[PDB]
């Protein structure tokens, strides 16, 4: 009771003050200036018409022009002029054009696009510094590769080695490979990119290779970063369709991904994470070792590892005096970490079933037998016996 009040003491006053502070300041900003900056703004608005057609800058020719490719079907030789500089632009950046006669009138985007919006996230990570136990060892391998160059680059220099680039998490479902990456990201306090690899692909053609570029482009602006491209399996060796409407799309999109990962330089400052079911849903060579270090094979919790996962859950639920910690383990045979969480959800539903406010002995025992029954084989001991 006393400490949840202390969270309230810290959060209510500081946070409530912060809203109020923003709200007055929006007025207050205006008042210091009354000419010069106001004037320049005023003529920016006369110059720039309403609406503005979006552009994408392909390239700058150094003579006060450029070439843009726009969602308007023909391309344009546009000029660079009015409240924009030649060096305020870089190629491949998104520009704002004048409706009447296309001209770069400045930038207020700088790689602002919807695919950027999905990718950047302001969400809170689900796990923070391995909240849920088990897989102690595997995290002390992600950390060596990913977290460790960011935190201390010096140690690699004494060693005289180049620092790693990226990790590949793979193997079993229900082992929380996608959640360890979230843990590592919160530990450092890095920039995290939840983009999903499957969100670049659509029926419509020719859109995809833009999207692959934009990932590497944004990641480098906000570096240091951790990039997670989750579920790069779907864009693997496989094909969209066996008829039509996708013969090209997977082929261009994957190839284009390998290229801009290597083309950065061999960096140890923008890490990638590829989350994949297996290497049998991807191409047999990726990009392909010395360059992609390290590879982490997830396999099923062992008796030690699954104990650890379980102890977390059971303590957050009523009672444990009824059926010993050991007696849960003993009854269970080795399975993924989802099966361990599943037994506890079912146990809780069973306490509801009885209409108890205690997880009784009976509830534990049934919940254990249920999961084992899904998920079953018996010809391991049938070949034998």
């Amino acid at each position: 009771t006393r400490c949840k009040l202390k969270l309230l003491r810290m959060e209510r006053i500081k946070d409530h003050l912060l809203l109020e502070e923003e709200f007055v300041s929006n007025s207050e900003i205006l008042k210091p200036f009354e000419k010069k900056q106001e004037e320049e703004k005023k003529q920016l608005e006369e110059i720039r018409g309403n609406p503005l057609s979006i552009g994408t800058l392909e390239e700058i020719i150094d003579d006060d022009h450029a070439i843009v490719t726009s969602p308007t079907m023909p391309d344009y030789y546009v000029s660079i002029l009015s409240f924009v500089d030649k060096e305020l632009l870089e190629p491949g950046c998104s520009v704002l054009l004048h409706h009447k006669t296309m001209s770069i009138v400045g930038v207020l985007q700088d790689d602002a696009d919807p695919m950027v919006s999905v990718m950047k996230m302001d969400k809170s990570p689900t796990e923070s510094y391995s909240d849920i136990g088990g897989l102690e060892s595997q995290i002390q391998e992600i950390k060596e590769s990913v977290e460790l160059p960011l935190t201390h680059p010096e140690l690699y220099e004494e060693m005289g080695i180049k620092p790693p680039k990226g990790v590949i998490l793979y193997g079993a479902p229900g082992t929380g490979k996608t959640l360890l990456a979230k843990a590592v990201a919160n530990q450092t306090s890095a920039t995290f990119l939840r983009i999903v690899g499957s969100e670049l692909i659509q029926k419509y053609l020719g859109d995809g290779p833009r999207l692959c570029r934009q990932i590497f482009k944004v990641a480098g602006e906000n570096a240091p970063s951790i990039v997670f491209i989750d579920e790069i399996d779907a864009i693997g060796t496989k094909r969209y369709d066996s008829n039509s409407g996708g013969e090209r799309e997977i082929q261009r999109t994957m190839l284009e991904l390998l290229n801009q990962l290597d083309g950065f330089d061999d960096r140890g400052d923008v890490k990638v994470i590829m989350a994949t079911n297996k290497i049998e849903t991807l191409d047999p060579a990726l990009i392909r070792p010395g360059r992609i270090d390290r590879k982490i094979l997830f396999e099923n919790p062992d008796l030690s590892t699954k104990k650890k996962i379980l102890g977390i859950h059971t303590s957050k639920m009523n009672l444990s005096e009824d059926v010993n910690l050991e007696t849960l383990v003993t009854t269970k045979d080795d399975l993924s970490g989802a099966d361990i969480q599943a037994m506890c959800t079912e146990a809780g539903l069973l306490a509801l079933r009885e209409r108890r406010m205690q997880v009784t002995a009976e509830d534990f025992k049934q919940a254990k037998e249920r999961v084992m029954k899904n998920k079953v084989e018996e010809n391991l001991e049938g070949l034998y016996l």
């Binding site: 003491r9 209510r12 006053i13 409530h16 003050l17 109020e20 709200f23 007055v24 007025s27």
Partner: protein, 71 residues
């Protein structure tokens, strides 16, 4: 002719919103603030005298002025 200046009423309006909002925001912390406070006032003074504090001041209720003119 009417009043054709209201520029300085913006300044009134801005600082009215500042002080009132913090006041509201503070209420949680404000509870314990009163316990701390009352003793130091006993030690020193209320605001200029050690008398007219044998109750809250000397009246539970309050003085309000209300004008019911309508002409």
């Amino acid at each position: 002719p009417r009043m054709y200046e209201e520029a300085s009423g913006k300044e009134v309006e801005k600082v009215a919103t500042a002080v009132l909002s913090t006041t509201a925001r503070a209420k949680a912390r404000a509870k314990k603030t009163k316990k701390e406070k009352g003793p130091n006032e006993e030690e020193k003074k209320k605001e200029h005298e050690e008398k007219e504090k044998e109750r809250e001041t000397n009246k539970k209720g309050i003085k309000e002025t209300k004008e019911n003119d309508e002409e």
